[PDB]
Amino acid sequence: GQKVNSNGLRFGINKNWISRWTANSHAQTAKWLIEDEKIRNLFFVNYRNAQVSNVEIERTQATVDVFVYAAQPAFLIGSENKNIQKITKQIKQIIGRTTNLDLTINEIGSPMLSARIIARDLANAIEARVPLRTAMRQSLIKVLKAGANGIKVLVSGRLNGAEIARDKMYIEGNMPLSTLRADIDYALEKAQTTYGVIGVKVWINRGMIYTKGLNRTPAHILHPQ
Amino acid sequence: SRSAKKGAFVDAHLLKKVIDMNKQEKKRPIKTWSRRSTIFPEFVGNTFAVHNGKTFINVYVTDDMVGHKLGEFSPTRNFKQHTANR
Amino acid sequence: AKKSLKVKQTRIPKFAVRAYTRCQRCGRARAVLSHFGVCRLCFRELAYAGAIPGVKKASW
Amino acid sequence: QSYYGLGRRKSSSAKVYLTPTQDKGKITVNRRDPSEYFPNKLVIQDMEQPLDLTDLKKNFDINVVVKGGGFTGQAGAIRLGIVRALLQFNPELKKILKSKKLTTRDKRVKERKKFGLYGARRAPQFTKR
Amino acid sequence: MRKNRAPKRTVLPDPVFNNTLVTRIINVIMEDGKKGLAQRILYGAFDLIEQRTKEKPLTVFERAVGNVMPRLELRVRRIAGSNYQVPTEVPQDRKIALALRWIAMFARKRHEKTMLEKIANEIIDASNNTGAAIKKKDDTHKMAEANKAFAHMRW
Amino acid sequence: NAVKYPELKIKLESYDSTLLDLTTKKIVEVVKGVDVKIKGPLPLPTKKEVITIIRSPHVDKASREQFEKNRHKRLMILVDVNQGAIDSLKRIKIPVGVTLRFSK
Amino acid sequence: VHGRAEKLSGKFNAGKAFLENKTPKKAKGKTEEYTKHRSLNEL
RNA sequence: GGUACACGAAAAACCUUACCUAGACUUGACAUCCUUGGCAAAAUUAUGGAAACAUAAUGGAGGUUAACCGAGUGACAGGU
RNA sequence: CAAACGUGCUACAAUGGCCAAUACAAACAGUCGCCAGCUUGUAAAAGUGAGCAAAUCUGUAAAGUUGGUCUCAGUUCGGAUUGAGGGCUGCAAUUCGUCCUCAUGAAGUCGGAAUCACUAGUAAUCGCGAAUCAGCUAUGUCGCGGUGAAUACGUUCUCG
Numbered sequence A: 001g002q003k004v005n006s007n008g009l010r011f012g013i014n015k016n017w018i019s020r021w022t023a024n025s026h027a028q029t030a031k032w033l034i035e036d037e038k039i040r041n042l043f044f045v046n047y048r049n050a051q052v053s054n055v056e057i058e059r060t061q062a063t064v065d066v067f068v069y070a071a072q073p074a075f076l077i078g079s080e081n082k083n084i085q086k087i088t089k090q091i092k093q094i095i096g097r098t099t100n101l102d103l104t105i106n107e108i109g110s111p112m113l114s115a116r117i118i119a120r121d122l123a124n125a126i127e128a129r130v131p132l133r134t135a136m137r138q139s140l141i142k143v144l145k146a147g148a149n150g151i152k153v154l155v156s157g158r159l160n161g162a163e164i165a166r167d168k169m170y171i172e173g174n175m176p177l178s179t180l181r182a183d184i185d186y187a188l189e190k191a192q193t194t195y196g197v198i199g200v201k202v203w204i205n206r207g208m209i210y211t212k213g214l215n216r217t218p219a220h221i222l223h224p225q
Numbered sequence B: 001s002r003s004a005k006k007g008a009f010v011d012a013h014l015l016k017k018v019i020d021m022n023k024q025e026k027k028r029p030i031k032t033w034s035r036r037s038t039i040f041p042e043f044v045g046n047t048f049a050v051h052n053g054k055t056f057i058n059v060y061v062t063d064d065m066v067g068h069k070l071g072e073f074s075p076t077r078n079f080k081q082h083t084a085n086r
Numbered sequence C: 001a002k003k004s005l006k007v008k009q010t011r012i013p014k015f016a017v018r019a020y021t022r023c024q025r026c027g028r029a030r031a032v033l034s035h036f037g038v039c040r041l042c043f044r045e046l047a048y049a050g051a052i053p054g055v056k057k058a059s060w
Numbered sequence D: 001q002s003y004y005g006l007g008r009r010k011s012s013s014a015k016v017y018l019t020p021t022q023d024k025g026k027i028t029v030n031r032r033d034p035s036e037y038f039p040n041k042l043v044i045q046d047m048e049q050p051l052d053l054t055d056l057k058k059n060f061d062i063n064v065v066v067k068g069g070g071f072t073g074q075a076g077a078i079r080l081g082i083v084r085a086l087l088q089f090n091p092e093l094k095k096i097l098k099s100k101k102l103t104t105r106d107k108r109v110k111e112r113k114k115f116g117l118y119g120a121r122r123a124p125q126f127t128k129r
Numbered sequence E: 001m002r003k004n005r006a007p008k009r010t011v012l013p014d015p016v017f018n019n020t021l022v023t024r025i026i027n028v029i030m031e032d033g034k035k036g037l038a039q040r041i042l043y044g045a046f047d048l049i050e051q052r053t054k055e056k057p058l059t060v061f062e063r064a065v066g067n068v069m070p071r072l073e074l075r076v077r078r079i080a081g082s083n084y085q086v087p088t089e090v091p092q093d094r095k096i097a098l099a100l101r102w103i104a105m106f107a108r109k110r111h112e113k114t115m116l117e118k119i120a121n122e123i124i125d126a127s128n129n130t131g132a133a134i135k136k137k138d139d140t141h142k143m144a145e146a147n148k149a150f151a152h153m154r155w
Numbered sequence F: 001n002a003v004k005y006p007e008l009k010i011k012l013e014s015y016d017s018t019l020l021d022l023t024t025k026k027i028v029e030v031v032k033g034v035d036v037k038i039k040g041p042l043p044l045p046t047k048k049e050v051i052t053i054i055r056s057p058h059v060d061k062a063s064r065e066q067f068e069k070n071r072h073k074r075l076m077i078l079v080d081v082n083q084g085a086i087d088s089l090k091r092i093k094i095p096v097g098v099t100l101r102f103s104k
Numbered sequence G: 001v002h003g004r005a006e007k008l009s010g011k012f013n014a015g016k017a018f019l020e021n022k023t024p025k026k027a028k029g030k031t032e033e034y035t036k037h038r039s040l041n042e043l
Numbered sequence H: 001g002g003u004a005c006a007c008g009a010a011a012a013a014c015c016u017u018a019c020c021u022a023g024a025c026u027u028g029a030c031a032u033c034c035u036u037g038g039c040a041a042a043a044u045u046a047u048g049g050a051a052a053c054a055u056a057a058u059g060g061a062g063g064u065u066a067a068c069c070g071a072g073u074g075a076c077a078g079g080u
Numbered sequence I: 001c002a003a004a005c006g007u008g009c010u011a012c013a014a015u016g017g018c019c020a021a022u023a024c025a026a027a028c029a030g031u032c033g034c035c036a037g038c039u040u041g042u043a044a045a046a047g048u049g050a051g052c053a054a055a056u057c058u059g060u061a062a063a064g065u066u067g068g069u070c071u072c073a074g075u076u077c078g079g080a081u082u083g084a085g086g087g088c089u090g091c092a093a094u095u096c097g098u099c100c101u102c103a104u105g106a107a108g109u110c111g112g113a114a115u116c117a118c119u120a121g122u123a124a125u126c127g128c129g130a131a132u133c134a135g136c137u138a139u140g141u142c143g144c145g146g147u148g149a150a151u152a153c154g155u156u157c158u159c160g
């Protein structure tokens, strides 16, 4: 049957909001809400070879703050800090010159246990005609060896160019989805294939967080050893 | 219904045409799309071609039609007989 | 015929009553939340990702 | 030595003040006659349900302040408030009051309306054919 | 299948006449969830009984309800279809309830005026075992007596 | 000694609760480290808004999910501040989520 | 025996006076100012 | 069918609108890429107009082209 | 629009209709808004005009209590339909907005075969608020409170 979005079910209990701002009026509540979607979508669609896992936006009456975590920031940084200025001009045009931008590219710890880059890597393999079984098995084994809990990958679509759509799942461990105290990270990606669209869904379990707080601390962002 | 202070309503394009048309003796049908304009005393004696949706049906105003709407004296849909489904 | 309707809605009309509110991400006309300028089915994606601050699930 | 009780029922608070007296209890609700405040029915006695079987001859002067609810909810609130005030003067009464269960919050409040339903528990008419 | 009888809403205390049955019949004549309206109807009808019968209203009411009170109940069992009405002894709790329920249906159908006079007339007509509620009890008793053969028959 | 501002009635409100309590704790701690008599961090009723939206795009109006958004609110009125407290007031800082309604 | 006319005519006179009066007083709003979010009065 | 029928639609006079009748347009009302300039688009007042749109006006924030205003230009844009 | 079905509203009534006085909520919402009070108006409303960016100001609670009247009738039930005069929104209300006042007063007197919901603050019922919205016979939808029941012996039958 249908399941509630795993990320959306855990909001306001253990996970904070990716955008934290208070607008003036219902007209400024819409502009400040559509603009950040453009900014986030910009970051994710293009500038992808960097493995950006999550981008949070912080705005006040007039000051916009962006916190961008990535696995390979060299592509954002560019040659002797070139691409960074370039990307800055895009962001300024989107929100407006009248404001102040404060990009804060932060390197990420524990890159594996983030559902965004894993889903992006899974999706990338499918456009390159890589066999699905091998691609999925190889990504899971590196992820499992990296030291996390169970991962569930669902890749529904016109699998392998077929004319009848299927779906393949691969669970490996205890993934208690009905439980609220678990630290489950969820992300979704669209693999654009020559034969259509492939939907890849990745559930990752990153332990148990008895914390009653909403984020308030780096999750997989933390850099352990 | 319509308030008093506001009064009546014509598009004022019809008024210029109507004033011009009353001065000119050889009056001809007025092709108007404005069904919202109310029939004003000066309209009396003229003939109009109101847009029913497809064509312009001709209505000859009299000393009596004054007050109603110019589109009220023309139809929009037509129904005259059903057909046994069975 | 969606983008042109979206563009026409952005453009100011010649009468005030000619102005309607469309969703700002997509182009859906009906079921638009004036509180957010976002239609009902865009609100799910924003609420389920944390883009909208303070939007948590409700239990009553 | 006054006594204070705080009852509640159907979202209706109550502040009942028990004052020792020997010149008839003269029950009073919000500075107005209870026979004028409440309906002329057993509810006016429902309020005396814990004050009758034990006693009212001790002539307790009643000072009721209720803010919220209808009238049955207010009556239940002062009953709980009165009984809670009764639990500060001569603790055996508690035992007998406990028996009849007149010293427990009723815990009954109106449920929340649910989507797709015409009320708390009702549901739309079903048409199969 | 249920195999469980959870707490049966138990209440009895009555004030004006100390007869639990008065509260039950009040609840029976209840309509639209109006307690005050039903209370006025019963108490005014009881007041109407003082000027007519010159006797205690509770005594006449008990004399009426006990007289209306039935003995046999005809239930439903399957046999090639339909049911050959089986007479069974209904318990006392249901027994009073059915008696009170029957009183209300025939009281709200009398040719009389305000149900005050209607129910008073219905009740006064039942203290002498000659009324509309009696006929129903008479009919079910007569229906049960004819079908005594299939009585015992139980699943 | 001076005042220059009598009866500073600071009002706090935010979509989040714990941040609001934390922010109220920091302001109160600083304002008592200087010589000011805090009236008290009292809570005001929280205005909760609820929007009911059908999840599906096309059919099944009966199955409709629901959302709520609470704007937690607090009140705090300061009697006398003076420059000696104004400096702390300035370098106090407040996490974005929390919203202030200083009314002077 | 007026047969309508006079009374509806007066309404028409009011409307024609309205139409010839028409002044382009196009506007969109009412109450104004007091629209802000405050700050720490200088941060 | 249950699991459609106060359903999509949490608001069809105009708008919405996707439909019909008409009056108008063609790298187009919107977009990028390219050779090339920016010394505007608006809004509003006139005349003809059912209104689209035309012919005339204040020639317009700004910032020297930033964004856009254009020309040239074929890949194309577009389709509820 | 000759018709048929589904979901709701209003009723066929003295557990009521009409008139007067009057007590008791919760939740939510509000600066192109909530609109107090005052003046005019048979009324919808208009003008003046404070107060409230809100536990502060505003959004009349109704059923309920008492008194008067109606006396079982197609009625002081029931409001449809129709005609006229007004008010509001909006360029614009005829196709196709709603409100008020006057005028009229269809059917309907408990509804065939057959069916639906509900196990306590539940069914029934009385109001209040919000969303989209310039305005809208939304009687719809999502919520909030006031009053507030009856029954469950049992699984033989019935559906899953």
Ligand SMILES: [Mg+2]
Pocket: C002, C003
């Ligand atoms: Mg489209």
Ligand SMILES: [Mg+2]
Pocket: C017, C019, C020
């Ligand atoms: Mg509109």
Ligand SMILES: [Mg+2]
Pocket: H003
């Ligand atoms: Mg289906």
Ligand SMILES: [Mg+2]
Pocket: H017
């Ligand atoms: Mg249209």
Ligand SMILES: [Mg+2]
Pocket: H039
């Ligand atoms: Mg210039």
Ligand SMILES: [Mg+2]
Pocket: H038, H064, H065
């Ligand atoms: Mg230049």
Ligand SMILES: [Mg+2]
Pocket: none
């Ligand atoms: Mg006050």
Ligand SMILES: [Mg+2]
Pocket: I060
């Ligand atoms: Mg008033």
Ligand SMILES: [Mg+2]
Pocket: I077
């Ligand atoms: Mg009537």
Ligand SMILES: [Mg+2]
Pocket: I093
């Ligand atoms: Mg009309």
Ligand SMILES: [Mg+2]
Pocket: none
């Ligand atoms: Mg159950």
Ligand SMILES: [Zn+2]
Pocket: C023, C024, C025, C026, C027, C028, C038, C039, C040, C041, C042
């Ligand atoms: Zn949308």
